[PDB]
Amino acid sequence: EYNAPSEIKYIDVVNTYDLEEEASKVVPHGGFNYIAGASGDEWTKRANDRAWKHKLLYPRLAQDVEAPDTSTEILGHKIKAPFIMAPIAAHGLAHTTKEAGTARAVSEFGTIMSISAYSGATFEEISEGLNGGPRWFQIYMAKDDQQNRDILDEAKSDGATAIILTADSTNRDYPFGMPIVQRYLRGTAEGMYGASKQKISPRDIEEIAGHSGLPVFVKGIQHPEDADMAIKRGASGIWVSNHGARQLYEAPGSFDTLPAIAERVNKRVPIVFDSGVRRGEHVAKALASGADVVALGRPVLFGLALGGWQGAYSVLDYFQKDLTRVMQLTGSQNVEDLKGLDLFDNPYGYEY
Amino acid sequence: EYNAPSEIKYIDVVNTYDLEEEASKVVPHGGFNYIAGASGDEWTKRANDRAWKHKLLYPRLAQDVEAPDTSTEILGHKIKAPFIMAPIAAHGLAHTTKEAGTARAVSEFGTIMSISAYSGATFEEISEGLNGGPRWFQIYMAKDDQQNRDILDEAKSDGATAIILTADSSKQKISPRDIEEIAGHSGLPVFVKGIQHPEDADMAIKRGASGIWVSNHGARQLYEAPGSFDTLPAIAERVNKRVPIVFDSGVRRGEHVAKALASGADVVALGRPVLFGLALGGWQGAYSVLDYFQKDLTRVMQLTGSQNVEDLKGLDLFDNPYGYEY
Amino acid sequence: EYNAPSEIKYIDVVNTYDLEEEASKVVPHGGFNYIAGASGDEWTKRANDRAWKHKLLYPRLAQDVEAPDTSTEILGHKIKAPFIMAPIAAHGLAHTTKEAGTARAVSEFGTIMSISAYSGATFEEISEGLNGGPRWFQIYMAKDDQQNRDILDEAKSDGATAIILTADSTNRDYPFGMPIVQRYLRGTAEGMYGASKQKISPRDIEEIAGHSGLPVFVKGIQHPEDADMAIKRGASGIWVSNHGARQLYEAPGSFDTLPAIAERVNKRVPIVFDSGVRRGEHVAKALASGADVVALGRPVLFGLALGGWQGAYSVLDYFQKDLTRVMQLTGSQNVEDLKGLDLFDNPYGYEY
Ligand SMILES: Cc1cc2nc3c(=O)[nH]c(=O)nc-3n(C[C@H](O)[C@H](O)[C@H](O)COP(=O)(O)O)c2cc1C
Numbered sequence A, C: 001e002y003n004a005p006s007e008i009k010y011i012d013v014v015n016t017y018d019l020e021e022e023a024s025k026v027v028p029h030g031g032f033n034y035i036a037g038a039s040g041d042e043w044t045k046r047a048n049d050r051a052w053k054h055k056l057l058y059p060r061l062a063q064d065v066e067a068p069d070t071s072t073e074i075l076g077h078k079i080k081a082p083f084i085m086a087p088i089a090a091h092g093l094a095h096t097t098k099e100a101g102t103a104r105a106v107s108e109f110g111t112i113m114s115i116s117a118y119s120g121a122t123f124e125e126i127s128e129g130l131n132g133g134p135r136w137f138q139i140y141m142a143k144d145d146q147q148n149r150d151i152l153d154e155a156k157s158d159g160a161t162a163i164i165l166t167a168d169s170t171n172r173d174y175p176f177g178m179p180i181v182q183r184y185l186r187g188t189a190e191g192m193y194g195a196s197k198q199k200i201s202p203r204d205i206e207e208i209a210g211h212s213g214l215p216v217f218v219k220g221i222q223h224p225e226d227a228d229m230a231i232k233r234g235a236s237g238i239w240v241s242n243h244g245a246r247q248l249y250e251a252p253g254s255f256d257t258l259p260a261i262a263e264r265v266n267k268r269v270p271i272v273f274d275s276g277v278r279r280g281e282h283v284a285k286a287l288a289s290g291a292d293v294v295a296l297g298r299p300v301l302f303g304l305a306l307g308g309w310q311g312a313y314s315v316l317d318y319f320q321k322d323l324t325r326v327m328q329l330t331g332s333q334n335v336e337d338l339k340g341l342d343l344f345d346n347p348y349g350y351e352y
Numbered sequence B: 001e002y003n004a005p006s007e008i009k010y011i012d013v014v015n016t017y018d019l020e021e022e023a024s025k026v027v028p029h030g031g032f033n034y035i036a037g038a039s040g041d042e043w044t045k046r047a048n049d050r051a052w053k054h055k056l057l058y059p060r061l062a063q064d065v066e067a068p069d070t071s072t073e074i075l076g077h078k079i080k081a082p083f084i085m086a087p088i089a090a091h092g093l094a095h096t097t098k099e100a101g102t103a104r105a106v107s108e109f110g111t112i113m114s115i116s117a118y119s120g121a122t123f124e125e126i127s128e129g130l131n132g133g134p135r136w137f138q139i140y141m142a143k144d145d146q147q148n149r150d151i152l153d154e155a156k157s158d159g160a161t162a163i164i165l166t167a168d169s170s171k172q173k174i175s176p177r178d179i180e181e182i183a184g185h186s187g188l189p190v191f192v193k194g195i196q197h198p199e200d201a202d203m204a205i206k207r208g209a210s211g212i213w214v215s216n217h218g219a220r221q222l223y224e225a226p227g228s229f230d231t232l233p234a235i236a237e238r239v240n241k242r243v244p245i246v247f248d249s250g251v252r253r254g255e256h257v258a259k260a261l262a263s264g265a266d267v268v269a270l271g272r273p274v275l276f277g278l279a280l281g282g283w284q285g286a287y288s289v290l291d292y293f294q295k296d297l298t299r300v301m302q303l304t305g306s307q308n309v310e311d312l313k314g315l316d317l318f319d320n321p322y323g324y325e326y
């Protein structure tokens, strides 16, 4: 049917870019393209990557004697480093252990797992990987209110401590099901993508926030006015993202949108940043630019492909270790120091 | 002998600027100049005032049905509106009830009292006026380490819930080292007051400050310096949520409170206008000024489409490159 | 063990870029990569190079009748041209004559030799090459104060006339020892990289400046506030560098950071600039931008690989000759004239 990698092993991650080409060797071409690809000719995916060169880190003298500490807290969860796992569908395309494998890596590492509504694994399978670890549940806005009630109940029953409401549903130049949604779509026509609204409104955000009983992050924000509207509608977090360039084409690199959003949010709610994080330097730059944590996506999936949970763990370990080095060089003892970094504005962009 | 005003009465505050001239009629000349005056020819005091015209508010549509609510919280304490009382010395120059009067107005209103290092009332006198209300103690850095340890113990025993370390006086200027010494021994969150440069904010936080208090002390210290409000955004962007920000120096209107919040302050501190209210009516006069700011802020919230203090933190400001003369 | 080149000969240096590929042919692959490589994917090494195109030289009419003179003075040492040798570890990776070979080229040319704490040559070997020439000693900040006392004593005993305190210790996508540090680390656990603080503080600078009995340059400065802090802590010089892009990744090209630092230093102490100097035009641009001298690194090492001391000398000679031509074209009679040059701001960057 679909011959996903099944090997479990640690990997020596020197950088995350090479994981893409390495994964291409073990992942079936179709599944690999699904994971790696983006809208149009990928210009906005390239923009997500090149945006990091727009603001450059300065090395700075230390002001504290202690060894660097990457730990932080979000929504009262203490986590080992300022990154969490982004919600990503169909991990089975990368590895036979699928979302259970990712959840194991995330829980063992000591951060938060985001569960896609479109998970290929059952929650029971994921739960076994999580082994008590914190988890957030990502949902789409259903056209049918009953389906929103259903998924919100599922999330709470599954011990979710936040909801991630993704603003965009579903663009470029599927071997298994989705048990988590099928659980409540069975016997309805919707269970036989189109069940969700293509785009959410402030009214949608207000409905989910009122009925979730959990803090709601609105994911896919790129414009500061949307951030303000979302918070006024009852969002408890803003998740700055263009979903790894998988949706709107010929849009800005995600990092370029972050400061304007952070300035408008002005501490009202936590900010999660994603779309293009590949290096420890990127984590630091996002924090310096107003994010509280970043979310990791494709690199963790490529690690999963290459080594199951241990491969995914290796990627998380890479980010933590690289971040520590960046902290040393920038004179930062802790995650809060990173939030205070001055960045060099590079008007020349990528080619310098 | 000094004949300070002694009457206690509410006053109809239409604007705070007029309180200065009105207070000049009742406060002895020497004391009044001490309160109203600033360094040099007062150009930086004027700059504190004119800076508010550099960033202008937009009227905007509402997105919530509820009436405005000015309440906020700082360091876990719920307060009626996003402003506190600044530490000011020698309130007896303004009114016979001195700091007890101001403390009464502040506690009756429902916000935080800052107690100056150079208060003319005893703690017992101030405590009576506070009636259990929250208070923060402002200190200068003593050259003697034991005097610092003693003042910090005294503050904590007197029920202080924060320490305000004023950067400019005692040592005439503080260093990161000084901040570290105070933060390490206080048992309370320490605000560093008098910050105008973002690198100082970063150094202070790294040295152990639990808050940054953006201030030029109402233009009473360095002359030919920027208006305090112009320094706020750069500091806020560098602090980047690490610790709460108190802003002061020039707040005269509800619009100023809104603009400070939109620019990264958590609360502002009020100074001269409250003292002028005290001169004019004792605690009830000072209360009248706090009430004015609360009511004026409520109007500004309505007009900007803001239901609560958080909405204020999200406002967009119009950049006015023309400055005061437009 | 390690088959370093040993031939001694002059080389016809047409440009320094070609010396890299030429050296790659004679230097063992491992040692060559150590010398040539930089952090991440080398984007910041490329930035060091491309930064030179951000400020362009104007040809200008002459105002003096005399022939150009490249001589200058720093810390009262008169030197033949406004460049010195940067401190670089393990010259034996390039050539069997190692640091003695470099020191000979530098001393014969008539400039200052910087001695890395991580030299592969003994001081006695280096001294023979130096033959009385001026030398500065580069140190790292030891965690153990005794080790700092030791190296400061070594430097003075070796006739050093300045200390170079490198701010960063030890990042990318060793056949011999270090006799200079082993001399005082022997019998301690440290002698059996981790002995130094990862990053220095102003307090560290103050300690070294108070106990050195010599002017102390703080090396690795890229931010003006660090320059001010370093000077207030007792530094007698600022050495603007990102260590040839070998430390912090996704940082600015070193030359782009120089004017802001020079403006803050405001003549208080001399400035040494390095990281990417490849041409006489670069020396001129650095001087026009506030440096007193530049330091040369990789090109001198590649020359050493290709021809021992005579090869290294050829590179120094190339820079002096090329600088002279630049002086003629810019209407400059002397090094001071270079400090007064107007540069053309190029907002387009490298691709123009
Ligand atoms: C294979 C793939 C599937 C994804 N599925 C979802 C999804 O189910 N829900 C969602 O909110 N985001 C989804 N995302 C977007 C991610 O949450 C995240 O925003 C993105 O991976 C970040 O970009 P990066 O991985 O390039 O750094 C997916 C991304 C990819 C790579």
Ligand SMILES: Cc1cc2nc3c(=O)[nH]c(=O)nc-3n(C[C@H](O)[C@H](O)[C@H](O)COP(=O)(O)O)c2cc1C
Residues within 6 Å of the ligand: B034, B035, B036, B086, B087, B088, B089, B116, B117, B118, B138, B166, B193, B215, B216, B217, B218, B219, B220, B248, B249, B250, B251, B270, B271, B272, B273
């Ligand atoms: C009369 C006078 C006395 C002051 N005394 C102190 C003091 O004891 N300690 C201190 O930190 N600030 C002191 N300040 C500064 C205030 O805390 C505050 O920063 C200032 O009043 C704000 O400016 P504004 O009142 O013009 O808005 C004083 C200010 C004035 C007006």
Ligand SMILES: Cc1cc2nc3c(=O)[nH]c(=O)nc-3n(C[C@H](O)[C@H](O)[C@H](O)COP(=O)(O)O)c2cc1C
Residues within 6 Å of the ligand: C034, C035, C036, C086, C087, C088, C089, C116, C117, C118, C138, C166, C219, C241, C242, C243, C244, C245, C246, C274, C275, C276, C277, C296, C297, C298, C299
């Ligand atoms: C092979 C290599 C080893 C180095 N070792 C040291 C070192 O021991 N101490 C130090 O302060 N800098 C060291 N550096 C950095 C240099 O002092 C200098 O900053 C750098 O070579 C300048 O960049 P460029 O050679 O590309 O022009 C080293 C650089 C390289 C190329």
